[PDB]
Amino acid sequence: MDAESVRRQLRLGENATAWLSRLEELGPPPEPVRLPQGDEARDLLHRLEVPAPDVEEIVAATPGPDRDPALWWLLERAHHELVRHMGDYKVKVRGGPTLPYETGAAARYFHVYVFLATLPALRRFHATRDIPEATTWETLTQLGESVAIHRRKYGEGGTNMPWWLTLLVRGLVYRLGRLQYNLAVAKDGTPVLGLHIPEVGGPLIPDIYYDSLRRARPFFERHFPEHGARAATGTSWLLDPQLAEYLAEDSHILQLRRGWTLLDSEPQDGDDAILEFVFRYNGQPLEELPQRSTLEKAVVTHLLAGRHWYQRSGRIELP
Ligand SMILES: CCCCCCCCCC(=O)SCCNC(=O)CCNC(=O)[C@H](O)C(C)(C)COP(=O)(O)OP(=O)(O)OC[C@H]1O[C@@H](n2cnc3c(N)ncnc32)[C@H](O)[C@@H]1OP(=O)(O)O
Numbered sequence: 001m002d003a004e005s006v007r008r009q010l011r012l013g014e015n016a017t018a019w020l021s022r023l024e025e026l027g028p029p030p031e032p033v034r035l036p037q038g039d040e041a042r043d044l045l046h047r048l049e050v051p052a053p054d055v056e057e058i059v060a061a062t063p064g065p066d067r068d069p070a071l072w073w074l075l076e077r078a079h080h081e082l083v084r085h086m087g088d089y090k091v092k093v094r095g096g097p098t099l100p101y102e103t104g105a106a107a108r109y110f111h112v113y114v115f116l117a118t119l120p121a122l123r124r125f126h127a128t129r130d131i132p133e134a135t136t137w138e139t140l141t142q143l144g145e146s147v148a149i150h151r152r153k154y155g156e157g158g159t160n161m162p163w164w165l166t167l168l169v170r171g172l173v174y175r176l177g178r179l180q181y182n183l184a185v186a187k188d189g190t191p192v193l194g195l196h197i198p199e200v201g202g203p204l205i206p207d208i209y210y211d212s213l214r215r216a217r218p219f220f221e222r223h224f225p226e227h228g229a230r231a232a233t234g235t236s237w238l239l240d241p242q243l244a245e246y247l248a249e250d251s252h253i254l255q256l257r258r259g260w261t262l263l264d265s266e267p268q269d270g271d272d273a274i275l276e277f278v279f280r281y282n283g284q285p286l287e288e289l290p291q292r293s294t295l296e297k298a299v300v301t302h303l304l305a306g307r308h309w310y311q312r313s314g315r316i317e318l319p
């Protein structure tokens with residue numbers, strides 16, 4: 001196998017060329033790839049909060065060097081790419097794209113396999129930084145979420161947003177209680193925390209929001225003193241002023257976002273993104289969508305009335 005035959009066998013488009021070129025140049029990792037198998041796999045994937053229908057598919061499809069030569073070449077070199085700049089927030093590492101699914105379930109779950117392969121390196125990095133065992137495990141559960149969201153959106157197996165799993169398994173995302181933080185750098189090169197609200201964890205009550213937000217600064221000072229971020233950033237449908245037209249006075253979103261300062265910048269279209277995060281939308285007719293919560297009602301009514309949603313970018317300066 002080489003880059004050209006791997007492209008051909010895995011049905012990859014021409015736009016995969018530069019990533020494959022990078023992988024070919026890296027070659028196999030200095031530490032051989034070991035994927036868990038059988039019940040070791042079941043146990044780990046449960047701990048990672050992967051849902052049951054997927055667990056069995058992922059376990060059954062586990063690739064090997066002789067059974068899946070092209071995918072194995074790819075997994076090996078993709079994994080290598082992640083350990084090579086492990087924990088280094090000054091280098092951009094795009095993982096691969098989502099692979100073509102016609103090649104089978106191993107391709108469909110490729111990023112799960114890259115994730116599992118890279119866990120020992122990730123954990124070695126966490127230990128050198130003295131990351132507590134609990135925060136490593138809570139952070140790693142993003143893998144369950146990625147898988148769950150894919151099946152929820154498409155009704156079939158996969159990983160949602162593999163660039164996020166890639167960043168997390170490179171030691172650059174930490175979940176602290178309800179919230180996730182990534183060690184980023186802004187346009188001007190100054191350190192910043194990217195703040196993300198994952199889906200798993202329930203409603204954003206103020207107590208769980210502030211308990212996380214207060215822990216961020218000293219956590220990253222204790223474990224990543226080199227980084228030095230003082231602000232946090234995020235861009236979201238959640239920061240659209242129009243939500244105040246619809247949501248009730250005691251809304252956690254309306255209350256908690258008052259702590260954020262909105263950046264003024266060119267309009268950012270938010271119909272796709274709100275439909276994504278409110279419905280995990282997949283092109284169905286609007287009248288077919290669930291209409292239980294006041295937000296579900298609001299999103300649909302607003303859109304049906306010929307009006308639009310926006311994303312906004314915001315910042316905090318941290319407590
Ligand atoms: C808020 C301050 C922080 C703002 C900074 C954000 C910038 C950071 C960048 C990001 O993190 S972008 C990714 C954001 N993540 C997501 O959107 C994940 C999916 N969203 C959710 O899980 C919820 O929207 C969330 C937990 C974040 C908030 O839910 P809450 O229920 O705590 O919100 P709230 O109290 O304001 O909701 C009021 C009404 O809207 C409903 N609602 C809110 N989110 C909903 C949702 N996602 N789907 C269906 N309904 C939702 C909620 O049920 C309720 O209706 P009812 O009283 O009729 O029940």
Ligand code: NA
Binds near residue numbers: 084
């Ligand atoms: Na490199």
